[PDB]
Amino acid sequence: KVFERCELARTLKRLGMDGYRGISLANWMCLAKWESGYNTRATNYNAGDRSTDYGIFQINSRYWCNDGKTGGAVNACHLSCSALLQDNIADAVACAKRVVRDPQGIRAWVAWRNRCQNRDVRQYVQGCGV
């Protein structure tokens, strides 16, 4: 599914993402926006290392989910990568929370660093009632 901006912001608030491990809601919004355009079915194959990024947060199969074809991969979120392509984002959110529990936090995503870090991200949540 392709979420609308404020619909996603309200969903993420309810799922407890606001301030999770010190990360504001607008930072999560900025991340979803640049990783998938708020698209839960997005997938990106990395020909260079044979991994795939899945879902709204573009979570990688080398460490976080199992797709069986990745190669020396772990499944830190204990999920099939298929779970990250559902319209319901509860599993994707649970996994994104696991990702930021590692030392890098939100910096795990290079898109976050280039496109969101040290920027005015208020635009992503403006007028959503969150």
Query: How far is Cα 24 from Cα 29, in angstroms, rounded to an integer?
Result: 9
20 DSSP β-pair partners: 23
Whether residue 76 contacts residue 58, with contact meaning beta carbons closer than 8 Å, is answered with: no
User: Among residues 80, 90, 105, which one has the least CA distance to residue 40?
Assistant: 90
* Three-state secondary structure readout of the chain: CECCHHHHHHHHHHCCCCCECCECHHHHHHHHHHHHCCECCCEEEECCCCEEEECCCCEECCCCCECCCCCCCCCCCCCEHHHHHCCCCHHHHHHHHHHHCCCCHHHHCHHHHHHCCCCCCHHHCCCCCC
H or E element, residue 97? helix 90-100
Q: Are strands 43-46 and 51-54 parallel, antiparallel or unpaired?
A: antiparallel
Residue corresponding to tokens 């997005």: 42
Pick the CATH number of 1-130 from 1.10.3210.10, 1.20.59.20, 3.40.228.10, 1.10.530.10: 1.10.530.10
Q: Which of 4, 7, 18, 35 is catalytic?
A: 35
Q: Which of 7, 49, 53, 120 is catalytic?
A: 53
> Where in 16-109 does DSSP place strands (E)?
43-46, 51-54, 59-60
Residue 82, token pair as written in the block? 């298929």
Half-sphere exposure of 89 (CA within 13 A, CB side): 29
Non-local CB neighbours of 78 within 8 Å, separated by 6+ positions: none
Query: How far is Cα 28 from Cα 50, in angstroms, rounded to an integer?
Result: 26
Query: How far is Cα 99 from Cα 86, in angstroms, rounded to an integer?
Result: 18
Rg (C-alpha) for the chain, rounded Å, is 14
Residue 49, token pair as written in the block? 């290392």
Whether residue 15 contacts residue 90, with contact meaning beta carbons closer than 8 Å, is answered with: yes
Active site residue 35: yes
